[model samples]
Target: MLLYKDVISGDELVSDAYDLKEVDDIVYEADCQMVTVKQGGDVDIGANPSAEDAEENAEEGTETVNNLVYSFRLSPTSFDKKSYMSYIKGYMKAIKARLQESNPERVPVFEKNAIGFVKKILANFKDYDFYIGESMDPDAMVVLMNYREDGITPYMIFFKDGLVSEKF
Candidate 1:
């Protein structure tokens, strides 16, 4: 998971923050104040079911959890809105560029299959806004954001070597 925090001065001294985390098989984002990502299971029925059977199988339980595994905090005084927005765009682009650079042969196929979706979301920048809230202590504000992609789910596990162990 990756986290980034940036502040922007506008009509109300807005701050922007983002975090990414992965849980179970679903991916989720805590973008600003919104938490809209979700996934679940579905049931299928066969065409050869008995006349008396209205359903083909019993319901299966499904689980959902956050997928943005990274988070960050930024100082309000250090944020520049214009730069921050550009940074977000460039950051995502850089990831795609690096992926293609590392695997040239698959670049075309990958772009055709995946890049389109990402590009669509990137195109809609203004529609999304970061959430800012006031703190009870003083002239302080908090911002939260989550904008994570799906399909590629990340996980952390512990492993023990012959003489050592590590987990993250």
Candidate 2:
């Protein structure tokens, strides 16, 4: 199961493993909130989920990620918006350049909003068979986001172990 908390409204939303649509709705509709995944399940994000994990996983050829909690945060107050936004823009540009170099036929454009960001994040679970593969079940899934100005701008995301943060 997944527990979603509305930081502003103080509301909680829960969904079972079979309810991905419901998960998506809560994630997108929350406009950036807190989500907690407790013993939800293991996620197979393929090898190299991160630079540090890459080396560790490469040694063992492990592509699965299992953790008690996975938190998602956007526009967290701790970050300075000016520098954070600049870093994000620069990172995006770098990714685009690298992607274009490999696949010159197509251009990858990433959205810069709460909905767009969440959409991409959710896609990871789908891409990695998070929903379909129940081999390693977790307790719950958690998400925490902070988009101060109406869930727009200062687009930054953090996941447990910075797993999806770099990719995002």
Candidate 3:
């Protein structure tokens, strides 16, 4: 789909945060290597949330690409879109510090279709213990949502686990 192509482009991958060396190094490593995206902007990342430490942990990172976690971490900074990393990083940090998941003890605010979908997924959530820092499709760049009136986005749910719901 045109949208799919637009969602994951080279510019999206070959920009700030990690330079070509860093991104390419991980992309080529046996463990950190992506599933579908080979040397490009598109990356199907898995449960590793340590791209932040990719440089420091490059050794073990290349051997421990775990598939068990579904949570994923993405930075708009990874694209050329980042003019102010400090602001974005702070915003993302705040989200991680609070309000990233469904708080059952509190009134759940999940709306219409998302509510319905989350209920279905939560049916066995305990068994899976789905975490927020990972995703099944380890290579999704940025999960795009159009939120059209036709409800086409439900069909565009690309990753089951790596649903980074907030934007920094």
Candidate 4:
């Protein structure tokens, strides 16, 4: 998961390509001016084949919040909206309970931490803004944050048709 802001320039679009290199683990030492813009946001000019490969195969794009499509690696899985919400709420309650138990006087800190945790998770999925686009298909966007080993915990948010709504 890469989180970033997308910026467009005149006849050229630039994105704050976050965590794409980190997640992909491909070295990108060349200067940005070295690469040639192929089409729109596409860059086809690069000496490093590895970097080119990584960029070509990367999933650095935008998505719609209301309608999402995710394919998890876990097997034998199914979508359950109620169960998902319960899981998220349970986690929230547990974190709050633990914080309260640790220091009841530090209510503000607990609240802040709780909100931070939610923000971290939402940002992980690039869905912090809840922005919905006109197209149903996934759009190209920038990643703001890279997926950390402990940063994302998947939870289903919606269940409709035959799809399961899960996010980190």
Best by TM-score: 2
Best by lDDT: 1
Error of 4 at 57 (Å): 29
Q: Put down candidate 3 lDDT per residue, 1-168, tens digits, no spaces.
A: 011111222111212121111121111100112232222122555454434433454242323222211112322222222322343244334333333554432223322333464444345433322211132222332232222245432211222121222222
> Which should have the higher lDDT, number 1 or number 3?
1
Weakest ten-residue segment in model 2 by summed lDDT: 159-168
lDDT for 37 (candidate 2): 35
TM-score of each candidate structure, all chains considered together: 0.26, 0.27, 0.21, 0.24
RMSD of each: 19.0, 17.2, 17.7, 18.1
Compose the digit string of candidate 4's lDDT tens values, residues 1-168.
321212210111111221112111111110011122233232335534443434545554443221111111111223243443454455445445644766566456545554555545544443322221122111211111222344442222210111111222
What is the Å distance of residue 69 in model 3 from its true position? 6.8
Candidate 3: regions farther than 4 A off: 1-110, 133-168
Candidate 4 accuracy as TM-score: 0.24
Off by over 4 Å in 2: 1-77, 108-168
Q: What C-alpha lDDT do the candidate models reach, one value each?
A: 0.32, 0.30, 0.26, 0.28
Backbone clash numbers for all candidates listed = 19, 23, 16, 10
On a 0 to 1 TM-score scale, where does candidate 3 land against the true structure?
0.21
Candidate 4: C-alpha lDDT: 0.28
